[PDB]
Structures are given as structure tokens and as C-alpha cells.
Design a protein around this ligand. Structure first.
Ligand SMILES: CC(C)c1cc(C(=O)N2CC[C@H](NC(=O)C3CC3)C2)n[nH]1
Ligand SMILES: [Mn+2]
Length: 302
């Protein structure tokens, strides 16, 4: 049958008073959000940070992703990597989506891309290939947020965003222990996806979509982490079942309905431009991009 969308994860629209400190706000919403694994945070309408990346010199080499690579298990010269700019990648991304759905990219419903994505993942008749830039360090290209540094120029109206606590460059990243950490950038297109994973050291993670088409998320609360791992190991290929989790997490693709049928609670959301997504400790999550977009993420500690 067709894909059944999971229930929506919590969406918070804090006022200017509640939006003062991120760590205190996440701590207040924890009793609900930790029961869903992921949550979406919409900043106030007037909170609009400018895009501070060097678009003129942004040249990256995206990865190549075959959607049905695991289903094909039942030659490593499929496609080279190539190099794009932010504009040339966007032209390729919009052309791919408009030609695939035979309609303008802004007219494709999010539910349709969602149902088609999971059909292509398990399809052996069609081989769809997409590209995406991932784990791009914001120290080589600059962060999407304004940052006080000698390289970039900060307008007076942009200094508040360079000093804001919701600026991902200002999140605490040093974990406490007895006796370098920079946000990463993500340039996506239609069907470009990330498989089920948790963060290193079970850390928190916060994600911001600077611009572009939405990013679809799926989340599992931490109390069902061991249940997801049991379902994953029972249905993964025998060659990948005994692999360590940090290696298995590279190919942990699974339809959310399969997890839901085994009793694993799964929540979804469409992260739109200007919205935050927070994943809680040991909350497995996965998803895909609806189209050409630009995201930034960092793991933080409380
Ligand atoms: C900070 C870093 C270690 C990180 C990123 C994520 C993550 O979960 N995401 C999901 C959305 C974005 N990845 C994509 O958009 C790829 C192209 C499909 C980053 N977790 N830790
Ligand atoms: Mn993550």
C-alpha cells in the first residue's frame, strides 16, 4: 500500500520572552519533546537572520546517492562526483524535480514527494540517483549565520544575530569530563536523504534551515531506542547486522511504516525555511529534502 505519514511532532512558537535563551527553552519543553524524540521550533516572525555565507566563492563537490542501493543487494563506477556552485547546484536541483514530477517545483505537494521517496527506496524497477552536499564545515565557506570575525563584514542591523543564542555558532559544545567544534552545512535537493542515526555521545543536536524547500524529518523517542535497534538488526542484511553501530548507521535506511508496524513510535515534521529542529539525546532520526535548500547543524550539550 501507499506510505502512511506518521503523526506530527510537537511544534513550538515561543514568544519573545520565551525565545530569550535556547537552553532554558529546550529544558522547559523537554517533558513533551523528549517523548517524541524530535520537535520543531518556529522563531518569532521578526527574527530573520541574514544569509552570511560567501555565495560567490561557494564551490563544493556533492556526494552521489542511489536511493535503492540496499534493495539492489537482493560495479563502483555508477557516477562521478563533479563540482557545483550554489547557483549551478540549484539549477540542477530545480530541473531534476520539475522534470521528475512534470510540474513547477513549488507546486509539488510535500505528501507526494514523501510517498514517492519511500516508493523509490524499495523499488527495484527504477534507479533514481540524486546528489547533495553534506558535512560541509562552515569554517571553509563561512557560516550561514553572521559571526564576529575579520573575514566577513557585519552590518549594524545584523550584529544581534551574530550575538544571538540561537545562532548555531554560539551553542555550547564542550562536554564535561575529567582532565574545533563548528557547525556543518548541508545543501540538499529533492530525494536527498539521511538514514536513521543518533549523535555521537548521545548528544543533543539542533538544525536550522536557512532557505529553500522544506526538509522532512522522522523521529523516534529515546525510550524506544533499543526497540528500533532490535527491529533494525532483525531486518538488516546479514552482512551488515553484525557491524558496529557507527558503521551500520551509514546504511540504516528503513521505511518508517515498518518501524511503526513493529511498535516503534515515529513522529514526522516538515521543517520549513527559518525554522529549527531539535533532536534529543539518543533520539533516532532520519529524513529527506523536498528540494533545493540550505541547512546548518551542530551538536550541543546541556
Ligand atoms: C552536526 C552534524 C554532526 C549533524 C547533522 C545531523 C543531521 O541529522 N542532519 C539531518 C539534516 C542534515 N543532513 C542532510 O540534510 C543530509 C543531506 C541529507 C543534517 N546530525 N548531526
Ligand atoms: Mn543527526
Amino acid at each position: 500500500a501507499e506510505f502512511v505519514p506518521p503523526p506530527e511532532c510537537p511544534v513550538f512558537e515561543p514568544s519573545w520572552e520565551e525565545f530569550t535563551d535556547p537552553l532554558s527553552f529546550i529544558g522547559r519543553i523537554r517533558p513533551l519533546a523528549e517523548k517524541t524524540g524530535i520537535c520543531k521550533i518556529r522563531p518569532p516572525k521578526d527574527w530573520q537572520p541574514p544569509f552570511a555565507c560567501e555565495v560567490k566563492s561557494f564551490r563544493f563537490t556533492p556526494r552521489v546517492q542511489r536511493l535503492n542501493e540496499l534493495e539492489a543487494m537482493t560495479f563502483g563506477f555508477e557516477q562521478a562526483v563533479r563540482e557545483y556552485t550554489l547557483q549551478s547546484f540549484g539549477e540542477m536541483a530545480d530541473n531534476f524535480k520539475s522534470d521528475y514530477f512534470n510540474m513547477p517545483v513549488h507546486m509539488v505537494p510535500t505528501e507526494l514527494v514523501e510517498k514517492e521517496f519511500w516508493r523509490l527506496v524499495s523499488s527495484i524497477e527504477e534507479d533514481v540517483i540524486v546528489e547533495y552536499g553534506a558535512d560541509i564545515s562552515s569554517k571553509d565557506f563561512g557560516s550561514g549565520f553572521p559571526v564576529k570575525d575579520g573575514r566577513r563584514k557585519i552590518l549594524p542591523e545584523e550584529e544581534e544575530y551574530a550575538l544571538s543564542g540561537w545562532n548555531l555558532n554560539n551553542m555550547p559544545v564542550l562536554e564535561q569530563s575529567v582532565l574545533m567544534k563548528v557547525p556543518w552545512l548541508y545543501v540538499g535537493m529533492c530525494f536527498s536523504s539521511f538514514c536513521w542515526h543518533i549523535e555521537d555521545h548521545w548528544s543533543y543536536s539542533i538544525n536550522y534551515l536557512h532557505w529553500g524547500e522544506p526538509k522532512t524529518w522522522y523521529g523516534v523517542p529515546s525510550h524506544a531506542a533499543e526497540q528500533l535497534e532490535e527491529v533494525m538488526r532483525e531486518l538488516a542484511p546479514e552482512l551488515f547486522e553484525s557491524q558496529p553501530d557507527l558503521l551500520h548507521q551509514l546504511v540504516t535506511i528503513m521505511n518508517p511504516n515498518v518501524l511503526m508496524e513493529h511498535g516503534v513510535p515515529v513522529y514526522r515534521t516538515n521543517q520549513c525555511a527559518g525554522e529549527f529542529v531539535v533532536t534529543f539525546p539518543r533520539a533516532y532520526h532520519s529524513g529527506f529534502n523536498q528540494g533545493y535548500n540550505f541547512a546548518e547543524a551542530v551538536n550541543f550539550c546541556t
